[PDB]
């Protein structure tokens, strides 16, 4: 939100500001990557759960 | 039911490996 | 998993060679 | 003068002829005459394959690859008609010669990319008014890229186009609607782009040399899968004859 | 099944005239064919040019017609292409080029008739096997 | 007298495994070939054996099991050319062209040849007779035939026997279609050598076991009737000969244990020697008997035999083997 | 690769020299009698 | 996804000698076409019609009438890339 | 490779069960 507000302050449209956000940064802001959301016998990689992330 | 396919061998080896260990030790104790 | 199984068996055989040679039952006259 | 027994096994057989640094002259083109290329030679030094992007939809880059088919990549003895068209511009029309070489390169990850490095039916033109072929003369045109395998080629299960089975015989009662792309073979024919940049000219012999850059598609395995975008760079040598 | 005279009866020229070979004559034409032809013409095919065979149907459509004794003997003297547009004795064994094809030197006129006959008789015995290839082996 | 200490340990008879001077070459080479084989059999990428840009997968990680797995022969483009690692621009190229194959078999053939010599060496150190190595020459020649001699005569290591189970079968089938090895009197002597070997092995084994002198009871193994290094023979050859001499006739049986055992060595070794030479001679295209269209009736019709049926089977392998590698009607290479 | 070639060449030479000098070191004498 | 080669067998190509696709070896099935005229036909291919084969430069009056006697055995379909590439018209990989 | 899902367990038991049988017999022999 700090990076978006900075973009809006520089005179960019709402579509431009959010487009400047790295997909890697948005991916960190997703509870599926939270290590406190798994299960003891939910085995394997995280991609076995929510799936393999393709795009934002 | 769509269970874990590795669940079968994991359960079987969970039983066999330590059970065999005890059977080995026992039989060789009686033969003494 | 097939590969792991094939290699595991092969590994056991090689191990068996080592024990059948250096830790064999010593032949006595 | 070198002979075959001096070159055999050295790798120089895959090397295009070169011109010394003192060859920056110009070969005059007289519109009254008819010209030809008696020998065109293309030696690739770098193969670039465009990575198939994730889902980012931003520009896909060409990554460096490694050649595994050794020194079997050079085109040579390519001859054709060099026409002087109305606006003074020159245009080369490829006719015959060793105008193709199968090449397999390996990408990071281990993926192998077979491709038919070729310039078949090349028609490359220059800018208008070329009184002489100088060291700033550029040749740009297009060529045909035929299928990597021809029509008689049989896959490991004996399927093909002009020959072979037309189904998966190992699976007699399998639904063929899924294996349709692997059962039905297709012969590809795509277009290629290439730019020949002259850097050296010997006006007394009619010999030119420089670097080229071509863009084409790789092998599609007779329609089995999608081809890759391949870029080939290297040097070239050509001799002009009236 | 035997080697009857009607089997050994082969066309002489291109206007209906025929000739009945003897059994020994056929055995001679067989021996001479193995001597100077078999290398390229085993079973009626052509190893150095599989597009042309020694089948009677093929010989008939040649120019000039080669489905007779008169035609084959002439070919063994002055061989030409299938259309007869050019002479090829320089690359095909013949009396005309027996200097570069030494096996054609000791071949008499009688020897050529027997060979020509064997070429015509054999497909009447083997059928489509003659000039068929490995398919009919 | 320092180099002498090294020589004594090398030729030492008190080592658990004898080293020897042949072993000085044998041990590194065999280890080299073995290590490379294990790695290649598991993790090697596909190999373009026929040199037509058609890579053949042979390793486990690339979709093979134990039965279908193989180390694939070097490319036909290479031929008989020596192709070490340092002759390739990269390991990727080296693997694509069948590099591991040459590395293994060359280290192996060297190691195996030294193995034979190593057998003579220990026998000399122990005061034995030295011809056990001569018996080992029979399988060693067989390995030399399919790994070295046949590629030489054919002009490529791509026509060498692949290092795999299915690849071996591929070698046998293609071989029959081109050489008719079955109708070759040397393979037939080889078959007679291995069938007879197995027969005589079962035969000798049964007759000695049958004539075992009772030293044990019914509640224990008969093997415990023999002690390692005992002076007395564990069986009765007189009784054994009495039996086998009546099974056929006495003059068809051996009363001499030395003469009998020599026959046991001679028969399969000589047999394998011939089938070894069979591959070696067929390497230069001196092929098996050809009786195709040999029987002819009075008219001239071909009367087929069992040989012509064999031919039809050979035709099937021929026209299908390496379906993309032939551009001309005659299969010479 | 040049480094590898030199390395193997030296390794091979070393062992071959052991084989030659080894058997030249009175091998017939090395027997029980 | 259709096999163009099989699909081309359902056209005139499967009945007559296609002057734009058929391998040169098929000209042997008729009199005086192989190999002279056969080479000329394939070389000057393709043709928009069968009769265009009569306008090949260098033909003699004898050659023209031979072609005329075999027009009924000829046909012309669209050039198939799968039949003309790799020099298949001169060698389709089929012998005996 | 789409292999049999029972291949792993069938192979594991084929090794383990008779080999365990042998091991058991051996250890009770050395103890005698
Ligand atoms: C410190 C140890 C450790 C850790 C933290 C991890 C972590 C990981 N491993 Mg690894 N792994 C380890 C050791 C470890 N591994 C070892 C030693 C091996 C060799 C056998 C492996 C073999 C291995 C494989 C083959 C795989 C992983 C995978 C994984 C991932 C998923 C793990 C999972 O789902 O577990 C599940 C955990 C459990 C179900 C918990 C088990 C609890 C036990 C059964 C309790 C036992 C209780 C006892 C019997 C009772 C006693 C009673 C008392 C009275 C005595 C994760 C990244 C997976 C992956 O993503 O690969 C890409 C995968 O496929 N690991
Ligand atoms: C016992 C040791 C030994 C031997 C005999 C060999 C032999 C071989 N190795 Mg191996 N290798 C060895 C150890 C050995 N290796 C070890 C320990 C390693 C691990 C580092 C390797 C790693 C290795 C690699 C990576 C490669 C080889 C390869 C080779 C081959 C070519 C070697 C070469 O060019 O030598 C050149 C040596 C000489 C010219 C010797 C010069 C000096 C002598 C005295 C000259 C006279 C020789 C003459 C034959 C007489 C000998 C005496 C007597 C028999 C009469 C050959 C099959 C290559 C291969 O397989 O290519 C396909 C290959 O790529 N080796
Ligand atoms: C029905 C049984 C039978 C018999 C009698 C034979 C017999 C023969 N087979 Mg055949 N074979 C058989 C089954 C049989 N085969 C089967 C089921 C298979 C698998 C499908 C094969 C596969 C096979 C192959 C692949 C080959 C043969 C060959 C042979 C020959 C040598 C075999 C040999 O040395 O064996 C080993 C056994 C011995 C050495 C013991 C002695 C055997 C001889 C023949 C006994 C002679 C007795 C004598 C006539 C008695 C004299 C009495 C008095 C005057 C003193 C021989 C002609 C080989 C061949 O073609 O050779 C020309 C060959 O290459 N066989
Ligand atoms: C009943 C049928 C039959 C029989 C009995 C035989 C019998 C034989 N065939 Mg024939 N064959 C048959 C049918 C048959 N064939 C058919 C139908 C075909 C046509 C498809 C063929 C095609 C054919 C071919 C093409 C070849 C044979 C060969 C052979 C021989 C194989 C054994 C051999 O070479 O041992 C010799 C022993 C060895 C090769 C082993 C060497 C081992 C080295 C020294 C050491 C290895 C160590 C190892 C790597 C590690 C050990 C580890 C351990 C210490 C822990 C034998 C004479 C082969 C032959 O004659 O080879 C000379 C051969 O090349 N056959
Ligand atoms: C209805 C009616 C008429 C009823 C009447 C019946 C009647 C009264 C009949 C009587 C008349 C009559 C005799 C009829 C028979 C007619 C007839 C000809 C029958 C023959 C049939 C026939 C051809 C049979 C086959 C013959 C045959 C088996 C030949 C075998 C030849 C052969 C393979 C020999 C090899 C033997 C050999 C080399 C052995 C050595 C190799 C070896 C490993 C030996 C192992 C070994 C050997 C030892 O030696 C000892 C010591 C020990 C330790 C040992 O390891
Ligand atoms: C040698 C002994 C014999 C072999 C073991 C015999 C079985 C013993 C029990 C094993 C149970 C393992 C889980 C079974 C389910 C399964 O299939 O897992 C299978 C998992 C893998 O999980 C798989 O992953 C795949 C992709 O790689 C897919 O996603 C599959 O769907 C998924 O099942 O195997 C493992 O995770 C092994 C590593 C386990 C690490 C545990 C770390 C924590 C350990 C805590 C120990 C202290 C607590 C206990 C103290 C007392
Ligand atoms: C990747 C490549 C990695 C390669 C790593 C390099 C290898 C490291 C090896 C370590 C050397 C020391 C270990 C010796 C073990 C040993 O065997 O000692 C076992 C015996 C013990 O040796 C005795 O040891 C005692 C002192 O500890 C005695 O006093 C004597 O000194 C000594 O003779 O070794 C011998 O008897 C000598 C002969 C050695 C035989 C080597 C066999 C080589 C086999 C080659 C073929 C194998 C390939 C196919 C496999 C199937
Ligand atoms: C018109 C052609 C004319 C011929 C032309 C040449 C043809 C070839 C001739 C070859 C002659 C060879 C003679 C060999 C003598 C010998 O080996 O003695 C060695 C022993 C001595 O016997 C033992 O001999 C002893 C006496 S003595 O001391 O040896 O003199 C005696 O005490 C003992 O009882 C006895 O068993 O012989 C035997 O033990 C008998 C069985 C040996 C069989 C021959 C050896 C194996 C042959 C090949 C087998 C595989 C072939 C088939 C493979 C599929
Ligand atoms: C108890 C017998 C069991 C035999 C089963 C196998 C039969 C095979 C077909 C017939 C073979 C004919 C040849 C016999 C040859 C013959 O004559 O045998 C005879 C022999 C008895 O001989 P003697 O008692 O005279 O032996 C004297 C001793 O001093 C040994 O020398 O019988 C056996 O050895 C039994 C053991 C066989 C074991 C074979 C291997 C079994 C492997 C089983 C693996 C199971 C895996 C399970 C996984 C879940
Ligand atoms: C290898 C050098 C050959 C030998 C030996 C013989 N012939 Fe041949 N022949 C050969 C070729 C390559 C061809 C076809 C080429 C061409 O354009 O003709 C032929 C053709 C014939 C023909 C014509 C068949 C036809 O369809 O018209 C005939 C009649 C013929 N050859 C006969 C013949 C005889 C009798 C031979 C033994 C003396 C003989 N040929 C040997 C190649 C070779
Ligand atoms: C953990 C893990 C895993 C695996 C597991 C396994 C499977 C293991 C195994 C292991 C093993 C199974 C091991 C083995 C080993 C063996 C050995 C180690 C042996 C050795 C031997 C030797 C060394 C010997 C040698 C010799 C000599 C010395 C000389 C003579 C010859 C001989 C050869 C004898 C998995 C994959 C799941 C996953 C990941 C993790
Ligand atoms: O590569 Mn393996 O096999 Ca001796 O033959 Mn020719 O090449 Mn290929 O065909 Mn048949
Ligand atoms: Cl094959
Ligand atoms: Cl070829």
PDB file of N, CA and C in Angstrom, chain H residues 36-62:
ATOM      1  N   UNK H  36      13.666 -39.147 -69.637  1.00  0.00           N
ATOM      2  CA  UNK H  36      13.842 -37.838 -70.264  1.00  0.00           C
ATOM      3  C   UNK H  36      12.693 -36.880 -69.959  1.00  0.00           C
ATOM      4  N   UNK H  37      11.508 -37.192 -70.473  1.00  0.00           N
ATOM      5  CA  UNK H  37      10.338 -36.349 -70.253  1.00  0.00           C
ATOM      6  C   UNK H  37       9.986 -36.265 -68.771  1.00  0.00           C
ATOM      7  N   UNK H  38      10.212 -37.358 -68.049  1.00  0.00           N
ATOM      8  CA  UNK H  38       9.953 -37.408 -66.613  1.00  0.00           C
ATOM      9  C   UNK H  38      10.745 -36.333 -65.876  1.00  0.00           C
ATOM     10  N   UNK H  39      12.023 -36.208 -66.220  1.00  0.00           N
ATOM     11  CA  UNK H  39      12.884 -35.195 -65.623  1.00  0.00           C
ATOM     12  C   UNK H  39      12.396 -33.793 -65.970  1.00  0.00           C
ATOM     13  N   UNK H  40      11.988 -33.607 -67.222  1.00  0.00           N
ATOM     14  CA  UNK H  40      11.515 -32.310 -67.697  1.00  0.00           C
ATOM     15  C   UNK H  40      10.227 -31.875 -67.004  1.00  0.00           C
ATOM     16  N   UNK H  41       9.301 -32.813 -66.833  1.00  0.00           N
ATOM     17  CA  UNK H  41       8.012 -32.517 -66.213  1.00  0.00           C
ATOM     18  C   UNK H  41       8.170 -32.051 -64.769  1.00  0.00           C
ATOM     19  N   UNK H  42       8.872 -32.847 -63.969  1.00  0.00           N
ATOM     20  CA  UNK H  42       9.086 -32.535 -62.560  1.00  0.00           C
ATOM     21  C   UNK H  42       9.842 -31.220 -62.388  1.00  0.00           C
ATOM     22  N   UNK H  43      10.838 -31.000 -63.242  1.00  0.00           N
ATOM     23  CA  UNK H  43      11.656 -29.791 -63.183  1.00  0.00           C
ATOM     24  C   UNK H  43      10.829 -28.524 -63.382  1.00  0.00           C
ATOM     25  N   UNK H  44       9.916 -28.554 -64.347  1.00  0.00           N
ATOM     26  CA  UNK H  44       9.127 -27.374 -64.682  1.00  0.00           C
ATOM     27  C   UNK H  44       7.824 -27.283 -63.893  1.00  0.00           C
ATOM     28  N   UNK H  45       7.617 -28.230 -62.983  1.00  0.00           N
ATOM     29  CA  UNK H  45       6.464 -28.204 -62.084  1.00  0.00           C
ATOM     30  C   UNK H  45       6.547 -26.985 -61.163  1.00  0.00           C
ATOM     31  N   UNK H  46       5.396 -26.499 -60.664  1.00  0.00           N
ATOM     32  CA  UNK H  46       4.031 -27.005 -60.853  1.00  0.00           C
ATOM     33  C   UNK H  46       3.330 -26.458 -62.093  1.00  0.00           C
ATOM     34  N   UNK H  47       2.182 -27.043 -62.415  1.00  0.00           N
ATOM     35  CA  UNK H  47       1.368 -26.595 -63.538  1.00  0.00           C
ATOM     36  C   UNK H  47      -0.058 -26.336 -63.070  1.00  0.00           C
ATOM     37  N   UNK H  48      -0.677 -25.284 -63.596  1.00  0.00           N
ATOM     38  CA  UNK H  48      -2.055 -24.963 -63.238  1.00  0.00           C
ATOM     39  C   UNK H  48      -3.031 -25.893 -63.953  1.00  0.00           C
ATOM     40  N   UNK H  49      -2.580 -26.477 -65.058  1.00  0.00           N
ATOM     41  CA  UNK H  49      -3.374 -27.463 -65.784  1.00  0.00           C
ATOM     42  C   UNK H  49      -2.471 -28.508 -66.432  1.00  0.00           C
ATOM     43  N   UNK H  50      -3.075 -29.602 -66.884  1.00  0.00           N
ATOM     44  CA  UNK H  50      -2.328 -30.707 -67.476  1.00  0.00           C
ATOM     45  C   UNK H  50      -1.673 -30.303 -68.795  1.00  0.00           C
ATOM     46  N   UNK H  51      -2.364 -29.468 -69.564  1.00  0.00           N
ATOM     47  CA  UNK H  51      -1.906 -29.088 -70.898  1.00  0.00           C
ATOM     48  C   UNK H  51      -0.702 -28.149 -70.866  1.00  0.00           C
ATOM     49  N   UNK H  52      -0.410 -27.586 -69.697  1.00  0.00           N
ATOM     50  CA  UNK H  52       0.727 -26.682 -69.552  1.00  0.00           C
ATOM     51  C   UNK H  52       2.055 -27.418 -69.713  1.00  0.00           C
ATOM     52  N   UNK H  53       2.002 -28.746 -69.672  1.00  0.00           N
ATOM     53  CA  UNK H  53       3.196 -29.569 -69.814  1.00  0.00           C
ATOM     54  C   UNK H  53       3.684 -29.576 -71.264  1.00  0.00           C
ATOM     55  N   UNK H  54       2.826 -29.131 -72.178  1.00  0.00           N
ATOM     56  CA  UNK H  54       3.161 -29.108 -73.597  1.00  0.00           C
ATOM     57  C   UNK H  54       3.958 -27.864 -73.977  1.00  0.00           C
ATOM     58  N   UNK H  55       4.005 -26.888 -73.076  1.00  0.00           N
ATOM     59  CA  UNK H  55       4.697 -25.633 -73.351  1.00  0.00           C
ATOM     60  C   UNK H  55       6.074 -25.555 -72.698  1.00  0.00           C
ATOM     61  N   UNK H  56       6.631 -26.710 -72.350  1.00  0.00           N
ATOM     62  CA  UNK H  56       7.976 -26.768 -71.790  1.00  0.00           C
ATOM     63  C   UNK H  56       9.008 -26.447 -72.868  1.00  0.00           C
ATOM     64  N   UNK H  57       9.874 -25.456 -72.603  1.00  0.00           N
ATOM     65  CA  UNK H  57      10.906 -25.022 -73.552  1.00  0.00           C
ATOM     66  C   UNK H  57      11.884 -26.133 -73.924  1.00  0.00           C
ATOM     67  N   UNK H  58      12.068 -26.359 -75.222  1.00  0.00           N
ATOM     68  CA  UNK H  58      13.041 -27.326 -75.696  1.00  0.00           C
ATOM     69  C   UNK H  58      12.443 -28.636 -76.172  1.00  0.00           C
ATOM     70  N   UNK H  59      11.123 -28.758 -76.078  1.00  0.00           N
ATOM     71  CA  UNK H  59      10.443 -29.981 -76.487  1.00  0.00           C
ATOM     72  C   UNK H  59      10.434 -30.145 -78.004  1.00  0.00           C
ATOM     73  N   UNK H  60      10.735 -31.355 -78.462  1.00  0.00           N
ATOM     74  CA  UNK H  60      10.650 -31.677 -79.880  1.00  0.00           C
ATOM     75  C   UNK H  60       9.212 -32.037 -80.236  1.00  0.00           C
ATOM     76  N   UNK H  61       8.902 -32.043 -81.528  1.00  0.00           N
ATOM     77  CA  UNK H  61       7.557 -32.374 -81.984  1.00  0.00           C
ATOM     78  C   UNK H  61       7.212 -33.824 -81.668  1.00  0.00           C
ATOM     79  N   UNK H  62       8.239 -34.661 -81.570  1.00  0.00           N
ATOM     80  CA  UNK H  62       8.049 -36.052 -81.185  1.00  0.00           C
ATOM     81  C   UNK H  62       7.704 -36.143 -79.703  1.00  0.00           C
TER      82      UNK H  62
END
